[PDB]
Ligand binder design. Structure first.
Ligand SMILES: [K+]
Ligand SMILES: [K+]
Ligand SMILES: [K+]
Ligand SMILES: [K+]
Ligand SMILES: [K+]
Ligand SMILES: [K+]
Ligand SMILES: [K+]
Ligand SMILES: [K+]
Ligand SMILES: [K+]
Ligand SMILES: [Mg+2]
Ligand SMILES: [Mg+2]
Ligand SMILES: [Mg+2]
Ligand SMILES: [Mg+2]
Ligand SMILES: [Mg+2]
Ligand SMILES: [Mg+2]
Ligand SMILES: [Mg+2]
Ligand SMILES: [Mg+2]
Ligand SMILES: [Mg+2]
Ligand SMILES: [Mg+2]
Ligand SMILES: [Mg+2]
Ligand SMILES: [Mg+2]
Ligand SMILES: [Mg+2]
Ligand SMILES: [Mg+2]
Ligand SMILES: [Mg+2]
Ligand SMILES: [Mg+2]
Ligand SMILES: [Mg+2]
Ligand SMILES: [Mg+2]
Ligand SMILES: [Mg+2]
Ligand SMILES: [Mg+2]
Ligand SMILES: [Mg+2]
Ligand SMILES: [Mg+2]
Ligand SMILES: [Mg+2]
Ligand SMILES: [Mg+2]
Ligand SMILES: [Mg+2]
Ligand SMILES: [Mg+2]
Ligand SMILES: [Mg+2]
Ligand SMILES: [Mg+2]
Ligand SMILES: [Mg+2]
Ligand SMILES: [Mg+2]
Ligand SMILES: [Mg+2]
Ligand SMILES: [Mg+2]
Ligand SMILES: [Mg+2]
Ligand SMILES: [Mg+2]
Ligand SMILES: [Mg+2]
Ligand SMILES: [Mg+2]
Ligand SMILES: [Mg+2]
Ligand SMILES: [Mg+2]
Ligand SMILES: [Mg+2]
Ligand SMILES: [Mg+2]
Ligand SMILES: [Mg+2]
Ligand SMILES: [Mg+2]
Ligand SMILES: [Mg+2]
Ligand SMILES: [Mg+2]
Ligand SMILES: [Mg+2]
Ligand SMILES: [Mg+2]
Ligand SMILES: [Mg+2]
Ligand SMILES: [Mg+2]
Ligand SMILES: [Mg+2]
Ligand SMILES: [Mg+2]
Ligand SMILES: [Mg+2]
Ligand SMILES: [Mg+2]
Ligand SMILES: [Mg+2]
Ligand SMILES: [Mg+2]
Ligand SMILES: [Mg+2]
Ligand SMILES: [Mg+2]
Ligand SMILES: [Mg+2]
Ligand SMILES: [Mg+2]
Ligand SMILES: [Mg+2]
Ligand SMILES: [Mg+2]
Ligand SMILES: [Mg+2]
Ligand SMILES: [Mg+2]
Ligand SMILES: [Mg+2]
Ligand SMILES: [Mg+2]
Ligand SMILES: [Mg+2]
Ligand SMILES: [Mg+2]
Ligand SMILES: [Mg+2]
Ligand SMILES: [Mg+2]
Ligand SMILES: [Mg+2]
Ligand SMILES: [Mg+2]
Ligand SMILES: [Mg+2]
Ligand SMILES: [Mg+2]
Ligand SMILES: [Mg+2]
Ligand SMILES: [Mg+2]
Ligand SMILES: [Mg+2]
Ligand SMILES: [Mg+2]
Ligand SMILES: [Mg+2]
Ligand SMILES: [Mg+2]
Ligand SMILES: [Mg+2]
Ligand SMILES: [Mg+2]
Ligand SMILES: [Mg+2]
Ligand SMILES: [Mg+2]
Ligand SMILES: [Mg+2]
Ligand SMILES: [Mg+2]
Ligand SMILES: [Mg+2]
Ligand SMILES: [Mg+2]
Ligand SMILES: [Mg+2]
Ligand SMILES: [Mg+2]
Ligand SMILES: [Mg+2]
Ligand SMILES: [Mg+2]
Ligand SMILES: [Mg+2]
Ligand SMILES: [Mg+2]
Ligand SMILES: [Mg+2]
Ligand SMILES: [Mg+2]
Ligand SMILES: [Mg+2]
Ligand SMILES: [Mg+2]
Ligand SMILES: [Mg+2]
Ligand SMILES: [Mg+2]
Ligand SMILES: [Mg+2]
Ligand SMILES: [Mg+2]
Ligand SMILES: [Mg+2]
Ligand SMILES: [Mg+2]
Ligand SMILES: [Zn+2]
Lengths: 83, 104, 208, 99
RNA sequence: GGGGAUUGAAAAUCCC
RNA sequence: UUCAAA
RNA sequence: UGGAGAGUUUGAUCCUGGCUCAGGGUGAACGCUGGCGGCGUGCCUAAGACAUGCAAGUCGUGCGGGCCGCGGGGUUUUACUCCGUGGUCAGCGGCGGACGGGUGAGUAACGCGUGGGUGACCUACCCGGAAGAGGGGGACAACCCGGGGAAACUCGGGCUAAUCCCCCAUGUGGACCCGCCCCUUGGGGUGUGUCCAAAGGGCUUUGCCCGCUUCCGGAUGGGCCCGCGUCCCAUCAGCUAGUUGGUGGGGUAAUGGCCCACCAAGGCGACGACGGGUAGCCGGUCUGAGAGGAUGGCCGGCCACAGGGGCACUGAGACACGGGCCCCACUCCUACGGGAGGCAGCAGUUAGGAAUCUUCCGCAAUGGGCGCAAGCCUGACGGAGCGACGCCGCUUGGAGGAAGAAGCCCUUCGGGGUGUAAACUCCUGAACCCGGGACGAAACCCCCGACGAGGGGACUGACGGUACCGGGGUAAUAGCGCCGGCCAACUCCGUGCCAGCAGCCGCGGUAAUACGGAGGGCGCGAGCGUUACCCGGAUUCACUGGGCGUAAAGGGCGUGUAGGCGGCCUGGGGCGUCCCAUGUGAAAGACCACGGCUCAACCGUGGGGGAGCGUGGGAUACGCUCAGGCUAGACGG
């Protein structure tokens, strides 16, 4: 099925992921369907996590199944926060 | 959209099928000059309606056979063998260039 | 490794006195002082009208040798200069003048550039507080270049920073001789500097 | 050596035989029905057609025929039988066809 | 095979 | 005869 | 922000013209040399052959059982036998082995690129919605008992469970045949008739979880078709019989000569068919002022292939690299009857070659398969290792220091060079030592809450004791190529048309700045040169941007086919052309701007940038086309 997971960008010892929508079967860093955010593990910048929540909510609405880590990051950006 | 082409019928020798010569025009990618270029499509005419010399429109269609992927949409201008003539002649010149030749 | 060898000889090959020693180059001894002819066994012989090329080569070799930078690095700066907006000539100079090692020297923390360089390699220098031992580090406008707290007591530091009292300094720079701080106010204008170099020929040398 | 995914092969063989057999039946009865109608025997011709219809659909329950393959067969069958019965037939059993 | 004569040096030519 | 000599 | 030219034909000149050099590039290789780090990158040849290990499995929350162990029962006791539980083994069943990883041999083609069509189609797992799951029956393997083989493995007999197979129901609903409205290629609705459903498991057991079935959608991934684009040779003209088309079938998810049976004679080609040669295509890369030219390694997309040929079966999906069958070649068993195998996966061997790395570490991260979960698998991948192969950063010292040691070189023998260079003085402190010591990792899970939102809690680091930080602290690698002109740099000696140099022009036959050495100098510097190859200079194939009287070049002349090109005025159309919107134009790259590693290389974020093509409007001067006129071209009298 289609997923929401991290694609690896950046460099050696300098990872920078991309929250992307893609077919489960595609190579990790292959062609994704849509970029819906980014994530910097080492938080070397105050802006190390961004997420187009409106868009994230969209793909979830249609089936996108998020990685456990992908889900973690989405939560931080209050994607499931239903307050 | 289903591509629509206009051309001339230069062959009515098949059952429910007509050959349609379609001219195209465009600037040469390097030399500019507008140049012509043609191609023949085998269009579907199930009612054996259109004849030699008609200017019909051709429309992109569900394959009818090998070669046939277009259906005759309608008649634009009936009769006019001048175009057909041109084609026939050009084809006859072929009878020339080879090991012998044909009269000019 | 940036050259490293007989230096008051380059002054002699460029027929112009370059300050690659600071003092000594002020006291009758930069060699240019009575012995201004090229180094070598033919130094005193009459020269021949140099080729438009020669002229352009020696000009670049002058400017380049002034900052003791490598051809590799010198070229990379010039290419960067070209690309950037505005007159390449000045812009180029602006960049050369932004090298931390050069700025250290400009602020007087060191007598020459080769010394200023070493002061950097050995952590005796600070940019906005953080240590920085990269002599090619590009100082931006607003940066504060000071001496490492732990180095402020060094013998050589006092001597140079002392001689800096009363001494004026670059209109694009500002020195607070007190805490041994300095501030890179802005990129120098071509008008600001006065190097014995016609940068115009340098551009031409690379245009070939 | 040894890759226990030989199991997939020994399983395919069973599935193969299972499919093969279901289809053989379908064909045999289809031909049977087309034949009976081709001879004008209306009542039993449908009676047989009706089984064939059923065998085809059930064949599609699983992964034997499946898809629109079933549709095609039922269609081409009800197609021939209704036509061949145009020899006076008159749908007696009126089973399959909805006259 | 030089070593001479000749040559600007050779090829050639004449010498040992 | 070869190469080179203003 | 975008354009440099030079040497060389002559005694000299101008021109024509070729050759050559200065500049960028590279998966490089070779020579001399070689200190540190980061990031990249590394079989370009035999798609030759491959030892060994690893590279796809998971599920006991689908089912039954074998073996080894322990415990508790039914008996007065034993035998026999019942239940529970641990380890393990493979079966049956399911999902995944069609992804991920490799390589291009093949392919000049709907293969790829770009834009479209499908009323001619499919899509497992995932998401939303509607409705369901009532009854019966059955088999095969495990296992047991025989038989055949050296082996690989096989044949027979008997027993048995399921989410295995089948029958009967219910039919939300769907499929098929006819009808009929509606719509328009096979789209949608409707009526009669016929046909078609299911699975059970878990439990913190009357309720929730994981599943099952039939439909309609979504989302994702696709198939097939079409327009245009895509190398060299015409010293390759003609090619074609399933060939081109038709009717009816077959076949497929689906169109189609895809295949078949009949019937027509047709299809293609100078706008290059057919044949031959070469080649995976693209985003992009290098070069260039641009237009172009060249290229397609790494990364991303598509395609093709899996020792060489064929084929299918299974399945949502394959005609399947680590699945199956047959033929061929090869290797290896072999009791010669018959078997086993396929690194273009990681690493490694061998061969070929000028040449290309470790049989490493880890699943900690990201991603993937199966599982409710715990978890298990993952040579994908994250890392480390080797190679100056490339880029970027660093160091081999800094300041003082003689009118200037020695030595070597030169000399007009007075002196001049190397040279502030050294020595020496004084500073700093790569290396190295000691201490501290990361980020990358917070989820899954557990508890509260309601397995939700939301809160709390806990376990995890290969890299690595590495980076970085703080102390202590030593003066501590320099080469390589040039110096006749182009082209920055000159003197002595030695050699003599020798020995040799040489990119081109040319040097050397006793005074050689050109050979070899030395002193000196120029250039660059952990690198410098050489070879090869691409673009440039080269307006040297000229679109931008060339020529043909004598330099290479007007066909020996005519007639004329195709084609190219076409006077003046008006009108219709609006194809070219032009304008406006709009869709498409993946990501990366490139460009600009900020950022993160102390800088940079490298990397992240954001921002324009349009050409091409589709759609929708609009314009009509020019070209085009259709109408009608005109005599100044042409033709006629
Ligand atoms: K669906
Ligand atoms: K047909
Ligand atoms: K290209
Ligand atoms: K929670
Ligand atoms: K001599
Ligand atoms: K010499
Ligand atoms: K060239
Ligand atoms: K001639
Ligand atoms: K008009
Ligand atoms: Mg006809
Ligand atoms: Mg047909
Ligand atoms: Mg500029
Ligand atoms: Mg298996
Ligand atoms: Mg299995
Ligand atoms: Mg039969
Ligand atoms: Mg003479
Ligand atoms: Mg003679
Ligand atoms: Mg000679
Ligand atoms: Mg010459
Ligand atoms: Mg020339
Ligand atoms: Mg001549
Ligand atoms: Mg001459
Ligand atoms: Mg003359
Ligand atoms: Mg070595
Ligand atoms: Mg490395
Ligand atoms: Mg290869
Ligand atoms: Mg493993
Ligand atoms: Mg016991
Ligand atoms: Mg057991
Ligand atoms: Mg098991
Ligand atoms: Mg793949
Ligand atoms: Mg490729
Ligand atoms: Mg070919
Ligand atoms: Mg295509
Ligand atoms: Mg295609
Ligand atoms: Mg094409
Ligand atoms: Mg296409
Ligand atoms: Mg396409
Ligand atoms: Mg397309
Ligand atoms: Mg049942
Ligand atoms: Mg049952
Ligand atoms: Mg049963
Ligand atoms: Mg049996
Ligand atoms: Mg039984
Ligand atoms: Mg079942
Ligand atoms: Mg109903
Ligand atoms: Mg209709
Ligand atoms: Mg039923
Ligand atoms: Mg043909
Ligand atoms: Mg058909
Ligand atoms: Mg069909
Ligand atoms: Mg065919
Ligand atoms: Mg053909
Ligand atoms: Mg054509
Ligand atoms: Mg042929
Ligand atoms: Mg061809
Ligand atoms: Mg090839
Ligand atoms: Mg290939
Ligand atoms: Mg050009
Ligand atoms: Mg190309
Ligand atoms: Mg690629
Ligand atoms: Mg093959
Ligand atoms: Mg294949
Ligand atoms: Mg094969
Ligand atoms: Mg092989
Ligand atoms: Mg094979
Ligand atoms: Mg499946
Ligand atoms: Mg199947
Ligand atoms: Mg395949
Ligand atoms: Mg296969
Ligand atoms: Mg395949
Ligand atoms: Mg595989
Ligand atoms: Mg393999
Ligand atoms: Mg070898
Ligand atoms: Mg490696
Ligand atoms: Mg892992
Ligand atoms: Mg994981
Ligand atoms: Mg549990
Ligand atoms: Mg394993
Ligand atoms: Mg890796
Ligand atoms: Mg190498
Ligand atoms: Mg010194
Ligand atoms: Mg000390
Ligand atoms: Mg951590
Ligand atoms: Mg875990
Ligand atoms: Mg609770
Ligand atoms: Mg320390
Ligand atoms: Mg320290
Ligand atoms: Mg000390
Ligand atoms: Mg010179
Ligand atoms: Mg001499
Ligand atoms: Mg020379
Ligand atoms: Mg370096
Ligand atoms: Mg140039
Ligand atoms: Mg050119
Ligand atoms: Mg040429
Ligand atoms: Mg031209
Ligand atoms: Mg010319
Ligand atoms: Mg002549
Ligand atoms: Mg001539
Ligand atoms: Mg003539
Ligand atoms: Mg005109
Ligand atoms: Mg015309
Ligand atoms: Mg008009
Ligand atoms: Mg138009
Ligand atoms: Mg556009
Ligand atoms: Mg893009
Ligand atoms: Mg920065
Ligand atoms: Mg960007
Ligand atoms: Mg108009
Ligand atoms: Mg025009
Ligand atoms: Zn000096």
């Amino acid at each position: 099925m289609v997923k929401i997971r991290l694609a690896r960008f950046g460099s050696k010892h300098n990872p920078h992921y991309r929250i992307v929508v893609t077919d489960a079967r595609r190579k990790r860093d292959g062609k994704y369907i849509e970029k819906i955010g980014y994530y910097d593990p080492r938080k070397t910048t105050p802006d190390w996590l961004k997420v187009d929540v409106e868009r994230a909510r969209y793909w979830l609405s249609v089936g996108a199944q998020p990685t456990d880590t992908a889900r973690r990051l989405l939560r931080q950006a209050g994607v499931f926060r239903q307050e | 959209p289903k591509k629509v082409l206009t051309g001339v019928v230069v062959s009515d020798k098949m059952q429910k099928t007509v050959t349609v010569l379609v001219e195209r025009q465009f600037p040469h990618p390097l030399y500019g000059k507008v140049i012509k270029r043609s191609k023949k499509y085998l269009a579907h005419d199930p009612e054996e309606k259109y004849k030699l010399g008609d200017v019909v429109e051709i429309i992109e269609s569900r394959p009818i056979s090998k070669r046939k992927r277009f259906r005759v949409l309608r008649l634009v201008e009936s009769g006019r063998m001048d175009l057909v003539e041109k084609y026939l002649i050009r084809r006859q010149n072929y009878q020339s260039l080879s090991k012998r030749g044909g009269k000019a | 490794g940036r050259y490293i060898g007989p230096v008051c000889r380059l002054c002699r090959r460029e027929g112009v006195k370059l300050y690659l020693k600071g003092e000594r180059c002020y006291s009758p001894k930069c060699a240019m002082e009575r012995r201004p002819y090229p180094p070598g066994q033919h130094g005193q012989k009459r020269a021949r009208r140099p080729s438009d090329y020669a002229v352009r080569l020696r000009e670049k070799q002058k400017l380049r040798r002034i900052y003791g930078i490598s051809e590799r690095q010198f070229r990379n700066l010039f290419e960067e200069a070209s690309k950037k907006k505005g007159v390449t000539g000045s812009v180029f100079l602006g960049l050369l003048e932004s090298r931390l090692d050069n700025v250290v020297y400009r602020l007087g923390f060191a007598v020459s550039r080769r010394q200023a360089r070493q002061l950097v390699r050995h952590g005796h220098i600070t940019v906005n507080g953080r240590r920085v031992d990269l002599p090619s580090y590009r100082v931006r406008p607003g940066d504060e270049i000071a001496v490492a707290e732990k180095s402020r007591n060094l013998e050589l530091i006092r001597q140079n920073l002392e001689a800096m009292k009363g001494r004026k300094v670059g209109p694009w720079l500002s020195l607070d001789v007190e805490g041994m701080k300095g501030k890179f106010l802005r990129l120098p204008d071509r008008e600001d500097l006065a190097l014995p170099v016609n940068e115009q020929l340098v551009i031409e040398f690379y245009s070939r | 050596r040894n890759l226990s995914a030989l199991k997939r092969h020994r399983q395919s063989l069973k599935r193969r035989l299972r499919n093969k057999a279901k289809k053989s039946a379908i064909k045999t009865l289809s031909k049977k029905a087309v034949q009976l109608a081709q001879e004008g025997k209306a009542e039993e011709a449908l009676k047989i057609m009706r089984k064939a219809e059923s065998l085809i659909d059930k064949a599609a329950k699983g992964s034997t025929l499946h898809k629109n393959a079933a549709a095609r067969r039922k269609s081409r069958l009800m197609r021939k039988v209704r036509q061949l019965l145009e020899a006076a037939g008159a749908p007696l059993i009126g089973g399959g066809l909805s006259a």
